[PDB]
Amino acid sequence: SLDRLMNPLIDQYLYYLSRTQTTGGTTNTQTLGFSQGGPNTMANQAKNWLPGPCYRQQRVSK
Amino acid sequence: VGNSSGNWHCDSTWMGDRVITTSTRTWALPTYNNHLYKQISNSTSGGSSNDNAYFGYSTPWGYFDFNRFHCHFSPRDWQRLINNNWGFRPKRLSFKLFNIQVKEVTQNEGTKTIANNLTSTIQVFTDSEYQLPYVLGSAHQGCLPPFPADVFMIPQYGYLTLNNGSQAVGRSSFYCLEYFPSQMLRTGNNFQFTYTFEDVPFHSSYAHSQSLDRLMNPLIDQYLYYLSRTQTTGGTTNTQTLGFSQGGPNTMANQAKNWLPGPCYRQQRVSKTSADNNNSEYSWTGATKYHLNGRDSLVNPGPAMASHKDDEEKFFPQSGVLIFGKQGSEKTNVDIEKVMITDEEEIRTTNPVATEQYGSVSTNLQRGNRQAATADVNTQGVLPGMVWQDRDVYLQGPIWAKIPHTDGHFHPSPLMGGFGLKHPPPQILIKNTPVPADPPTTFNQSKLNSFITQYSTGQVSVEIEWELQKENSKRWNPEIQYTSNYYKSTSVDFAVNTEGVYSEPRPIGTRYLTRNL
Amino acid sequence: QGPIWAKIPHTDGHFHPSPLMGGFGLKHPPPQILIKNTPVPADPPTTFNQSKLNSFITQYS
């Protein structure tokens, strides 16, 4: 599938946004935590292509 | 045994409109799972996410990873390329591999002697039919050393299939390369092969001298008209009327153009300045994404876009562009200073800005009793009349990608940027040959599990012959160029600190030379 | 027990380039030949690791 075309044993050598606020105790402040894409965070890994075109339709049951 | 398997051919040369290049590098080879296969899903896990579910197999094999540029071009040279040509396209590709050796390892009482076993071997092959799941186009680390003198290990290999959570479907497939012919190889014996690309549109490495709204003449006016008045304006009275006018040098904004900006995908904006961002964790929730088969996945880097508009250097798209990390970076929650972001101000010329609306439209038809309706557009498809430029490439970036062998593909230009092909270069895979240990004295039905752990190594290179369209611009004014600033710096650029670690100062673009639109 | 020749700086201006230590100069002097032992890594890990290698078999030729 379009989201599983990469290798599971490695990580992208790029980074992506993973933190908007601090997480170390009982305090909230503006911060920025960046990280690479791992085998455990595949969902966020940067892909290279895009799904196809679409037209929403109402659903129905058998 | 007493003869080199070839010479170290690694240079950069320019004979004119073509450029040849090769880089020799030394690698290593480790066995895996003791020559055994595997199954992988939420196992050596994370816990529960139809979005983080997977299904694949770790094979005892390894492969090559050189889909980047800093692996074929030293910086300077790349520069040379940039300031002189407008576009290029790689045509030829050679591959050499030699000087193999085999090492074994006996770990007795912590005392381990490492000698060679010149009689062992390995086997490699290629897939010229692309029957094996393609692994590249994912920019997985472990590319050839951006540097030439260092050495590296070859990343193991594993693929995946159509899955359903922690279970697979019937149609799920399962392959085993041990089913493919492979030039066997013993020490001293060499191996090489060759392939040649096919036709491809030269990735245009340049910017534009005008924007889609300023392509007309300032001294004249369109001989057409446009709506300029809905009501009267002559005193203290309001009545329905219609004032039409031509397009002048003072009303350029309204002048009828002939073409249309490119496609778009709205994204949330963010700042490099920590305090200017809202105080809420929206990294995963307020993020732009698509829905597929229940698994919701992010849309990165998404379509071609513009990082920001003028003077918005503080912001960039939430997940609209690439990011890099200076050498020494680790896996997670690192800060912004250990990384580098990509500036895309070069496309404001023709493509929209990610954190910006595409434009507005109406939702109704007014009358004397109905108010003028006006909505917004953050999602946009394409129509006849659009033009854009794909994402620019970066030296520390990917080079090409495998076009999915399907019935429908459109302007297959990859998103990370680069080049696509219906028949991409091939994947080469190697593994240490298995060699069993002392077997029993009598028979035993079961197969073997005891082998001499060993590893092998050697050096390789690759030749690339490209094409390039040299510039013909007669712009009089001196364009911009790429250069290391002339002030004094403690640590040189692309140098190696007093420790030998080689790091890059900033990422590098190619859209430097400005060519007319 | 002295030097034999020296590299004339590739410049636009040079005069009676006769070296000072004495000897012979040339616009295109003999060449420099350089050699090094080829690197050979040690036992690498069983799984992957992004970073490059630093462990090799120390040897000499």
List the helices and strands and how they pair.
This is part of a larger assembly, with three copies of chain A.
Chain A: E1 12-21, E2 30-37
Q: Structural class, from helix and strand content of chain A?
A: mainly beta
Order of helices and strands of chain A: EE
Main sheet: strands, sense, barrel of chain A: 2 strands, antiparallel
Summed up, the helix count of chain A is 0
Please name the two chains that share the biggest interface, counting residues whose Cβ lies under 8 Å from a Cβ on the partner chain: A-B, 46 and 76 residues
Name the assembly state: part of a larger assembly
**Rg for CA atoms of chain A:** 18 Å
Strands of the widest sheet of chain A, in order across it, are 1-2
Mass-distribution shape of chain A: extended
Distance, first to last CA of chain A: 27 Å
Q: Provide the helix percentage of chain A.
A: under 10%
Q: What fraction strand of chain A?
A: 25-35%
The count of strands of chain A amounts to 2
PDB class: virus
Keywords: Gene therapy, virus
Entry title: Structure of AAV-DJ, a Retargeted Gene Therapy Vector: Cryo-Electron Microscopy at 4.5A resolution
Chains A, B, C: Adeno-associated virus DJ
